[PDB]
Write an enzyme that holds these catalytic residues in place. Sequence first.
Site, PDB file in Angstrom:
ATOM      1  N   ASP A 160       3.954  14.028  12.124  1.00 53.03           N
ATOM      2  CA  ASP A 160       4.029  13.272  10.383  1.00 53.03           C
ATOM      3  C   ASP A 160       2.302  13.823   9.637  1.00 53.03           C
ATOM      4  O   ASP A 160       2.286  13.012   9.048  1.00 53.03           O
ATOM      5  CB  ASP A 160       4.972  12.950  10.421  1.00 53.03           C
ATOM      6  CG  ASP A 160       5.095  12.231   8.667  1.00 53.03           C
ATOM      7  OD1 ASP A 160       5.350  13.338   8.307  1.00 53.03           O
ATOM      8  OD2 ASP A 160       5.761  11.449   8.516  1.00 53.03           O
ATOM      9  N   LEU A 198       0.511  -0.836   0.127  1.00 54.96           N
ATOM     10  CA  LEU A 198      -0.092   0.159   0.018  1.00 54.96           C
ATOM     11  C   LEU A 198       0.710   1.833   0.078  1.00 54.96           C
ATOM     12  O   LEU A 198       0.916   2.114  -0.833  1.00 54.96           O
ATOM     13  CB  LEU A 198      -0.470  -0.074   1.403  1.00 54.96           C
ATOM     14  CG  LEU A 198      -2.155  -1.377   1.629  1.00 54.96           C
ATOM     15  CD1 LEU A 198      -2.964  -1.632   2.436  1.00 54.96           C
ATOM     16  CD2 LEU A 198      -2.494  -0.596  -0.518  1.00 54.96           C
ATOM     17  N   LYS A 203       4.823   2.852   1.188  1.00 54.76           N
ATOM     18  CA  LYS A 203       6.360   3.398   2.262  1.00 54.76           C
ATOM     19  C   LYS A 203       6.511   3.997   3.358  1.00 54.76           C
ATOM     20  O   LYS A 203       6.520   5.083   1.850  1.00 54.76           O
ATOM     21  CB  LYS A 203       7.177   3.274   0.836  1.00 54.76           C
ATOM     22  CG  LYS A 203       8.910   2.668   0.575  1.00 54.76           C
ATOM     23  CD  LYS A 203       9.150   2.384  -0.121  1.00 54.76           C
ATOM     24  CE  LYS A 203      10.485   1.485  -0.178  1.00 54.76           C
ATOM     25  NZ  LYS A 203      10.982   1.186   0.450  1.00 54.76           N
ATOM     26  N   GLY A 204       7.314   3.658   3.514  1.00 57.75           N
ATOM     27  CA  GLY A 204       7.979   4.650   4.931  1.00 57.75           C
ATOM     28  C   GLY A 204       9.777   4.437   4.482  1.00 57.75           C
ATOM     29  O   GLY A 204       9.818   3.925   4.649  1.00 57.75           O
ATOM     30  N   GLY A 257       9.293   1.883   7.016  1.00 60.80           N
ATOM     31  CA  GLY A 257       8.781   0.818   6.680  1.00 60.80           C
ATOM     32  C   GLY A 257       7.719   0.279   5.866  1.00 60.80           C
ATOM     33  O   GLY A 257       8.130   1.299   5.260  1.00 60.80           O
ATOM     34  N   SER A 258       7.005  -0.499   5.743  1.00 59.24           N
ATOM     35  CA  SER A 258       6.341  -0.152   4.907  1.00 59.24           C
ATOM     36  C   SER A 258       4.523  -0.814   5.200  1.00 59.24           C
ATOM     37  O   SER A 258       5.012  -1.806   5.808  1.00 59.24           O
ATOM     38  CB  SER A 258       6.241  -1.621   3.324  1.00 59.24           C
ATOM     39  OG  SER A 258       6.751  -2.531   4.484  1.00 59.24           O
ATOM     40  N   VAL A 259       3.576  -0.422   4.467  1.00 63.12           N
ATOM     41  CA  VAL A 259       2.384  -1.171   4.867  1.00 63.12           C
ATOM     42  C   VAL A 259       1.895  -1.933   4.242  1.00 63.12           C
ATOM     43  O   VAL A 259       2.049  -1.432   2.632  1.00 63.12           O
ATOM     44  CB  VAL A 259       1.461   0.074   5.373  1.00 63.12           C
ATOM     45  CG1 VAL A 259       0.353  -0.651   5.228  1.00 63.12           C
ATOM     46  CG2 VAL A 259       1.635   0.875   6.735  1.00 63.12           C
TER      47      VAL A 259
END
Length: 279
Positions: free
Chosen positions: A132, A15, A17-18, A21-23
């Site tokens: 954020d 879904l 990208k950080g 991390g990722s979702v």
Amino acid sequence: PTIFEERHLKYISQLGKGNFGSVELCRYDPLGDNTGALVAVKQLQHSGPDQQRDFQREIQILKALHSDFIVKYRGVSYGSLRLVMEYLPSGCLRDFLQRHRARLDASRLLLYSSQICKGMEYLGSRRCVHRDLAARNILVESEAHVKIADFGLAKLLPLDKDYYVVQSPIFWYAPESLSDNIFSRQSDVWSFGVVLYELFTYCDKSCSPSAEFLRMMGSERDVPALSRLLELLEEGQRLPAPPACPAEVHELMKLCWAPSPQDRPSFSALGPQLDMLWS
Ligand SMILES: C[C@@H](NC(=O)c1c[nH]c2ncc(-c3nn(C)c4cc(F)ccc34)nc12)C(=O)N1CC(C#N)C1
Ligand SMILES: [Cl-]
Ligand SMILES: [Cl-]
Ligand SMILES: [Cl-]
């Protein structure tokens, strides 16, 4: 219930990208027959110890937050800590505003503003600084319902203090964050002002916060971008009125960008000023 077994998470796709991390869209499918629910699951990437401990804090924060305007915690998965959350298929407001611009009127943007303001009022009541807040981190539940997400950089204010000294884009940052790494509920109010800008520009990339500010901060000198943005904000430079932005909404943005933290309105004060526009 709140414990998801790793081996029953069926990975579909990514879904978002950080930085750490990722979702991922997953189907939690214990029965193995594909009847299970689709969920959004955060895992860490390029993670050292510091990001791991941050993630443990983030899970506990999200878990403890109960608002219609804040993305729902579902549970966790061990094996490899993963955070399981409700999947909102309509996706993020940034993409949503660009996609449905032609059908989204000023009054609907004000609905979204008001709901985000409520969520942020709730966060302040739990002594939580989001850090954020941006259109990319708001999710669409329905046409008339958005929720705040991404608590990856969120800090609880200490019980005896209303600020915290502690990286997202600099274009959503308060001057006191830029200059002294200070974060507070009124630092979130500064960011909310930028979110209002995003909404009323429909997240158009040609006049994004970075596009406007980058243009102001010159071609280039032997000077970092951070110092030059801080200089411009201290000279009183702000994001302009979005094309066809209601006068009164632009004025609320400017109050959110008051140089001094104590001169910015509280989310509690902003809420009725958003709701009572045009009534
Ligand atoms: C904004 C955050 N998303 C979430 O926390 C979500 C929790 N439930 C969700 N349901 C749907 C989405 C989502 N769907 N789609 C199509 C997206 C497109 C996007 F660009 C970003 C998020 C989503 N994100 C979520 C996210 O994508 N990231 C935090 C960073 C990390 N780790 C990346
Ligand atoms: Cl499937
Ligand atoms: Cl589902
Ligand atoms: Cl939904």
